[PDB]
Amino acid sequence: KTRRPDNTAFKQQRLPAWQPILTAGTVLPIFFIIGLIFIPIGIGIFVTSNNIREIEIDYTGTEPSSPCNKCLSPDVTPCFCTINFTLEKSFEGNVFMYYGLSNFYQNHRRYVKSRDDSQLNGDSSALLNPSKECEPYRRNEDKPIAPCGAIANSMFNDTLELFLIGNDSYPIPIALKKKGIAWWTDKNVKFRNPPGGDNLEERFKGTTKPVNWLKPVYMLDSDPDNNGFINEDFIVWMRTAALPTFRKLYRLIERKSDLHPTLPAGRYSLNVTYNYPVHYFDGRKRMILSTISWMGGKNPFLGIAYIAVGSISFLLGVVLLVINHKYR
Amino acid sequence: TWQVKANDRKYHEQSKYANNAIKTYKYNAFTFIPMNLFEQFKRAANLYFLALLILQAVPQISTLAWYTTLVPLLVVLGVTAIKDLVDDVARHKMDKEINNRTCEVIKDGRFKVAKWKEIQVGDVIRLKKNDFVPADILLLSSSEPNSLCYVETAELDGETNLKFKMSLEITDQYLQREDTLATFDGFIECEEPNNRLDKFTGTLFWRNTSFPLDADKILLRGCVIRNTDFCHGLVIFAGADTKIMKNSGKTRFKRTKIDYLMNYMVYTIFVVLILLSAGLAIGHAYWEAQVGNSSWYLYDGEDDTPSYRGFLIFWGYIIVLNTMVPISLYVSVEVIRLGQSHFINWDLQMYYAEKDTPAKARTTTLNEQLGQIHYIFSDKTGTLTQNIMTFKKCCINGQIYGDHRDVDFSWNTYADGKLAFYDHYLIEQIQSGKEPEVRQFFFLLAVCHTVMVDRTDGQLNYQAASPDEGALVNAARNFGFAFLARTQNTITISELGTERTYNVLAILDFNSDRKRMSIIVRTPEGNIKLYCKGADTVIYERLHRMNPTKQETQDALDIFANETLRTLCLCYKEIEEKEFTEWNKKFMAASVASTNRDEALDKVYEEIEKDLILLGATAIEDKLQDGVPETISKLAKADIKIWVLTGDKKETAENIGFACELLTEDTTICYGEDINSLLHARMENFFPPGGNRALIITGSWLNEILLEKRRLEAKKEQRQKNFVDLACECSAVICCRVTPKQKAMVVDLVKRYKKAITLAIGDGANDVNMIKTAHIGVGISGQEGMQAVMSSDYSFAQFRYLQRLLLVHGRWSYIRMCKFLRYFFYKNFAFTLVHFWYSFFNGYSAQTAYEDWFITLYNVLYTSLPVLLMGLLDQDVSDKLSLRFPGLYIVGQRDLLFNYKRFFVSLLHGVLTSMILFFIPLGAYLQTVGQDGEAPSDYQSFAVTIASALVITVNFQIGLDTSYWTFVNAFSIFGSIALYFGIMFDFTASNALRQPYIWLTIILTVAVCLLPVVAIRFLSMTIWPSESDKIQKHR
């Protein structure tokens, strides 16, 4: 036929190689060092998670005999509630204010894609031309909606304030920062205001507000650095949730200048402007106050999981060891 | 009934006949594209991928880009279509070459040049020496006495010897001249076209008289004229009615057993896919009824009733769950198949150095079926042997020669040098001339024969009907006794370069029952010698009482027999002057027809050859190919059964059966007479031949057993089934005197009635039908026609290379394919079923759990290379240990590494991996992972983590799957994860992967997916180690 094949390791199927065999001198250790690493990590996470102080208040008021049921049917649109709670153990360091929504499918396919990221990126062409993605909320009557989509339209518009009920029974207001509650990239990369101009009013010219939004996007915050598409509350909302039960950052309680606890133990009152209706779909609103930890947040699932997986790895090694020895 | 009118192109044009052109190809310039019909329908996966392409076209129900399934489908369909276009266009060239072959035809009054297409039934043609027969013609005349023709039927059977052919007596003396042939008007009413090559029934009507016809007067298409200047005949069957083409089969499409297994197990994935989507679709209708209708945030206008919403996403979930059957599996198998084929091409241990012919993988689709072979059906001559048949030893007078004791052959110029004789004492004795028996021995070999001389270009070539005689005449020629030439009355032979023309007074004929031949030659002085040569048994029946060397020669024959050599006894006589004169008158009176001419000829033949003087015996070696008996033993240890299907004679086939060690002294040989009684007994009622272990049957007896109304059809399947049961309960089966179609019939019989994977190996056109019929077809290289080579899936030169094709290449290709299939499905069921689990937490809305960019690049960039390299480089044991342990071949023969159980076990593994990959991250984010302004457990983090854990888990699994850890294998497994984590780190996703809880979530998921798998992998091997593991452990 043709000349001799060339002699190479690849073509002659003689490439250098190792033939790893699952021997008892290799699999048994990794089944024991894993169990010796997963247990201390499981203990370390579990103890740290239980060292996190956190309080979760459910202020939807669906069930009667609660001081917020009046706002389920707010005959007057401005409705307010007052929930009193007591913090037994003083919170320390930075404390984060999250709000929690239950049975609110922010991961729904019809909901996740209902946005125009080009408009949120600050594109002039897409500012006045919402995409078909935000189809049901492209325009209100004649001109397009600036934050178009089911996402921006259904933004969380409740307001939450906390007061310290001190020894005098006079409510002391508690500082709450609204800046730095969103990703750095979201503030500076993913979200931007339309280019040109100096005042946000003219930039969003000829663009309706979302129908469910009470007010437009021009002045979401008094600070120009927190209004428009770069608003912290709006940005946090657009970052949809992976699961129906989720919580989103609302406010930051920074370290108090004094050595005293950031939220000293005592009587607290939750003053909430009930605006978001969730009881139609059996959804639950919540407010969460939690304290920071040097290992992130609180997650007893993982810490317990390593204990289970680490323990099982240790036990599996023993079972494999006995099976090996019998079959040696 | 057939009807042929010579020199009449318009006799029966008043369709039933066929023009003498052949159409072997399968496609035209237009009907090639409808090849999509074969590709689409036979493989339901292509139809499903076609449905997906259509299903993704409509924007109404769409979740993924359709550009990503059109491009691979074009690649999947395109490459297979391209492969069959090169195969078919090659068949166009061979058809054109045959059709453009030249022949001379009777035009109006003369012989003119014509092509093989222009020949038609009833057409008179003239063929010269060494010219292919263009059609099944009736011999009318020839250039030599009695209208005699010698023809080589090397395509009807694989034998290169000459076949005797005679024409009708009436036509011999009249149609000699071209003038009478042109005006010849003979009407033939013969048999209808058929595949029978040995039988022909018909008659010639001419000169108001009918002459019966036989197969001896009919030259068939696949033959060649030899030892005759020219011959003439009229075409009877043309083009496709010729017996050579009725002895041919269609080029079917060959696909592996694993290919059929994927088909049936891809049907179940379709059932799973529809059932999953229908179940998820129903849940959305229920979910949209309660939670979706009362959810104001989910309002999108265009009020759709919940039933319609459930209907809509059903097609959304087919698209979301489409990689239950991924298009990358079939794109990558083509890469695996092409690479595995090129290892056969590149092998140096299947490279024949002196002919400079390496192995060739002509079909790249069947590589892993080489590891599945149950039966081998092999040609004998050219495949097991070399078609070299030389003179090895001899017992002359009493002493045995050819023992390498103590050649140039320069003392005689005629010696061609082919003979590899080593003994020097014989050459010394010939030249010395100290013993007349030596000269008389080799004289007999060069005179008592039917061989014919060529004397073309000054070369003294010899052509014989019997390969035994041709070797003996060559041997005598090398030893000085050169048979120069022969006319009708005298035979010329050279003795040590001295011309000596002798006159022959009689040539006793050779018959199968006669088992001997003799020639009576008068010497120039006047002495009469009856030089006789025949079989061992018959010769000893006719010995003079004086013979003292009888016992010694019998002992010599036993020595030669033990070497499985072919032996013939040699004898002369000293008939007197008056005694021959009385007999010569008697002999002539016996040549006339009288009544039968058989009893009289046998009677006078018997009396001629009494009281003969022994000279000894010869020893002819029918050379086997190197490493053939080693190959048959090695493949027998692999539980592969080797059947020899040959067009040669029974005696030659049986002799090679013992030389190959297919038959041993332990085996008892069952013949067609014995088989028929056994089969007949079973009808009137595992087979006793289970202990006999040998089966030698003739093509004539195959028809009797195969028997080639509804009740008759019941007996047809019954008799065929019983024969296959008997023939399969035998260590060796040798089918002899079989036509090319009968070879494929035997291969087909095993396929249908045993469901066995069959291999067919052979050389020449005789084997193309069975090479095309078997599951795998091998073509031995060396035939100038290259007909078995160009119709075969693989083609090397030496039979011994079957060892590496099956035990090394076929065994690895089966291991490397089943490993590829089980993992590739695993990595895609784990990938895609995460969407199924997420449906219970997103409203059953068909939202994907991964970013769109991850879904496109999963099987492209992140899990592609490691499984392809493992499918091209994975060896459980080395090639040396592969041949040293043929019992490792039984792994594929029994279908162990790919099954419904093995397949479903990879479904569970993928199902449980998707379950863990979704529910450990779910628990880690149901509890608010790393809460801060930089990680509020968003959807992107959920998508990035499961993808991150998925890529690591599957890429580690392939590492545990790989046993031959080459550097390129190590680089791919680690580089796939490195590439994945390099793409989403600026060369969203980065933010999640910078946080300990996110990484400790991946580590937990990867371990919980892999760490259990190590336990079963280690536990299974320790308790139930495989044969490869034991060799690997003891390596």
Ligand SMILES: CCCCCCCC/C=C\CCCCCCCC(=O)O[C@H](COC(=O)CCCCCCCCCCCCCCC)COP(=O)([O-])O[C@@H]1[C@H](O)[C@H](O)[C@H](O)[C@H](O)[C@H]1O
């Ligand atoms: C650093 C180390 C690692 C580097 C790694 C480097 C990168 C890897 C390099 C080489 C390894 C082989 C890569 C190709 C893997 C198969 C590709 C594939 O199937 O993609 C398909 C889509 O992408 C394509 O269009 C590519 C098709 C052309 C491939 C060309 C093959 C060339 C092989 C060269 C080998 C050399 C090999 C040489 C070896 C020496 C995947 O489709 P799907 O199954 O995921 O989903 C299908 C479909 O596709 C749609 O998505 C649709 O949604 C539908 O419903 C769904 O069912």
Ligand SMILES: *[C@@H]1O[C@H](CO)[C@@H](O[C@@H]2O[C@H](CO)[C@@H](O[C@@H]3O[C@H](CO)[C@@H](O)[C@H](O)[C@@H]3O)[C@H](O)[C@H]2NC(C)=O)[C@H](O)[C@H]1NC(C)=O
């Ligand atoms: C806070 O957000 C909620 C959304 O959950 C707002 O409720 C929505 O308000 C819009 C208009 O304010 C309603 O749209 C339409 O209002 C007209 C009256 O102008 C009404 O007649 C129509 O039937 C239509 O609903 C929308 O229905 C309503 N949705 C719900 C669920 O109540 C709310 O106004 C916001 N409040 C603040 C203070 O931002």
Ligand SMILES: *[C@@H]1O[C@H](CO)[C@@H](O)[C@H](O)[C@H]1NC(C)=O
């Ligand atoms: C909650 O506090 C408010 C004011 O601080 C008070 O009017 C109300 O009665 C309190 N309710 C309960 C249940 O303590």
Ligand SMILES: *[C@@H]1O[C@H](CO)[C@@H](O)[C@H](O)[C@H]1NC(C)=O
């Ligand atoms: C709660 O907040 C509202 C809005 O500023 C304020 O008017 C009210 O006095 C606060 N305290 C209550 C309702 O007890």
Ligand SMILES: [Mg+2]
């Ligand atoms: Mg042959």
